[PDB]
Structure formats: C-alpha cells, structure tokens
Design a protein around this ligand. Structure first.
Ligand SMILES: *[C@@H]1O[C@H](CO)[C@@H](O)[C@H](O)[C@H]1NC(C)=O
Lengths: 49, 40, 191, 49
C-alpha cells in the first residue's frame, strides 16, 4: 500500500491465513460481509508407479 | 533464544515510482510472524 | 533526444584481438560497462564468418541502451557452429556450453573439451578428450553512440530518454521521487 | 499482456526489430487486443437490454 508521497505504509501476506487470501482476491484491506470464493484444493500424488 | 517477527522486513521491489495504488508483488520476503533466532 | 554525459569507448579491441583465447569447458567472461562504443564497427564486413542476432536487429544496435554487455570467449572445432543457437542439442550445447531458450544478443564466429557429463547443464553454467557471444538485458549505463539535443517543455514533442521512445507533452513535476527512483507509473501501468 | 510476444509495448518492438520479423510479433498483439474489445462490446450489449 503506497501513499501520496509514494512510500509503502502497509502490506498483506497472501498465504498467512484465510482472511489474508480473501483480502488479496478482492484487492482491498477492508472486506464487506459475505461469502467469497478464494481458491481450490487438490490432494497431491504420494508416489510414482 | 527464539522470538517473533511481527511485520518487519518489507523492502522496495524495484525503482518505479508509484503513488496511491495497491500493487501486487511476487518476490522473496520474510513471512509475517515467523520465528527468528536470538543471538547474544 | 536525451542520452547522458559520457564520452569513453568500450574495449571491443580487447576481446577481438587478444590472441590468447580460451576453452569450452572453462570459457572466458568479461563485463562491459560505462562506455559509448559503436556496434557498426562490427558492421564493417571484417573477418566475420557468422554474424547472427536474436532479440534485436544489427542495423538498430546503434541507438539502444543495454544496461550491460557480457562477452564470451572460447574456441570451437568449426563444424559445430550451429550448436551455439538456442534450443540445440549436441556435445557442446548439452555438455560444454548452453544458451538459454530465451536469448537476447548477437553471436559472432570466425583445446580440451569435456566428453562425459552426468546431467545436462543449466543455461549459462560453467573426462576431457581433445567465437564471441554478446549478451545483454533490456539505468542506461551502456548507451550506444547518438548525439543528444536540448530539452523543450509545454508542447507536443517526440522524445527519446535512454532508448525509451514516445510522444507527448513534457511539463515540470511536483511528485517527489526518492533518490533511487527513475520512472513513474499510474494505476493502469503506463509511464 | 504480451499474448506470447516479446513485449507488450509496441514502440519497443518497432525500435528493436526490422519489418520482416516485426510483423510476426505485431500479429500476436493484434489478435489478443481484438478478442478483448470483442468481449467488452458483447457484455455491454447484454447489459443495455
Ligand atoms: C508527504 O510528505 C510531506 C513532506 O514533504 C508531508 O508534509 C505530508 O504530510 C506527507 N503526506 C502524508 C499523507 O503524510
């Protein structure tokens, strides 16, 4: 988050917790009340055969 | 011996002036609330 | 046209006339910086059997700004000069000297070499049984030879600030930069 | 977006390349930009109704 002087004043780590990933999908630091799709999930293969 | 790293270690990724925007950066950072070793 | 105040030439005669070359398993590397030399001295149709450029065109090398030039020095046998192109497979391009799949530069051509190797090399990575490559990446800092002019404000001009071309109106700014910042952009990511 | 071309800026394709292999890079940007104008106009016609 830059400001009027062009200096960074805040940031958000997009893999810390679910609210941060919501904030990175909506590209804002305040989130209104709702339900939001953020990602997908998938189990990875354990080994080859 | 160990401690906490609240919101520290954010730098400038490049040398392009930006103002009042919300830029998304993909780079190597120190993750928030990680554990840093204390030396003495 | 605004190019910076700089006068000296690059040592291109250093790498092209030193009679001590190097090998392909251990090649010779040199950085070139802060010098205003010509590339059309190589356009002079000298003893250049191969003169081949990838990201640019050799007619347009005179008026760009490159930030760096790497120069490479080795000796090939002579028939394998088609293995110093991107995306080639061979005893040199896999075991001795490999260019990346995304290369920007020129290749100019006119004694141990490694035979066995357990894995193919990464791009630009350094039993043995017995050519200059210029690369660059697009601060000006190299800035080929072109005469600058004077600065005109408040009316519609063409401009050229270290190879960055465009057209528009130049006024004075009130946006305080910080003394490492050069460009400036907006929400839509335009200069 | 560069749409598969070497640059998303058109001036520094025209300043780096010669007219044989500049058109190869300009056609990629032309098709990518036509498709996005076409998508914009179609959804504007659906909202206007
Ligand atoms: C920006 O910096 C100037 C100092 O030149 C200061 O007066 C101004 O308050 C700063 N802006 C903000 C939003 O803090």
């Amino acid at each position: 988050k830059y400001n009027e002087n062009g200096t960074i004043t805040d940031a958000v780590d997009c893999a810390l917790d679910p609210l941060s990933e919501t904030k990175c999908t909506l590209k804002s630091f305040t989130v209104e009340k709702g339900i939001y799709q953020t990602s997908n999930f998938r189990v990875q293969p354990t080994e080859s055969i | 011996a160990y401690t906490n790293s609240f919101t520290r270690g954010v730098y400038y990724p490049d040398k392009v002036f930006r103002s009042s925007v919300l830029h998304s950066t993909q780079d190597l950072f120190l993750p928030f609330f990680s554990n840093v070793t204390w030396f003495h | 046209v605004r190019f910076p105040n700089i006068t000296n030439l690059c040592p291109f005669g250093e790498v092209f006339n030193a009679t001590r070359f190097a090998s392909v398993y251990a090649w010779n590397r040199k950085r070139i910086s802060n010098c205003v030399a010509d590339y059309s001295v190589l356009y002079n149709s000298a003893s250049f059997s191969t003169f081949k450029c990838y990201g640019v065109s050799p007619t347009k090398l005179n008026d760009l700004c490159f930030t760096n030039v790497y120069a490479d020095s080795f000796v090939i046998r002579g028939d394998e000069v088609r293995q110093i192109a991107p995306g080639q497979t061979g005893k040199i391009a896999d075991y001795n000297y490999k260019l990346p799949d995304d290369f920007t530069g020129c290749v100019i051509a006119w004694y141990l070499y490694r035979l066995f190797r357990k894995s193919n090399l990464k791009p630009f990575e350094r039993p043995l049984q017995s050519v200059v490559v210029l690369s660059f990446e697009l601060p000006a800092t190299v800035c080929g030879p072109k005469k600058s002019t004077n600065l005109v404000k408040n009316k519609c001009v063409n401009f050229n600030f270290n190879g960055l071309t465009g057209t528009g109106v130049l006024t004075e700014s009130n946006k305080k930069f910080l003394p490492f910042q050069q460009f400036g952009r907006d929400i839509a990511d335009t200069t | 977006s560069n749409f598969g071309a070497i640059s998303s800026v058109l001036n520094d394709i025209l300043s780096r390349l010669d007219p044989p292999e500049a058109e190869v890079q300009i056609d990629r940007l032309i098709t990518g930009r036509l498709q996005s104008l076409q998508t914009y106009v179609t959804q504007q016609l659906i909202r206007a109704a």
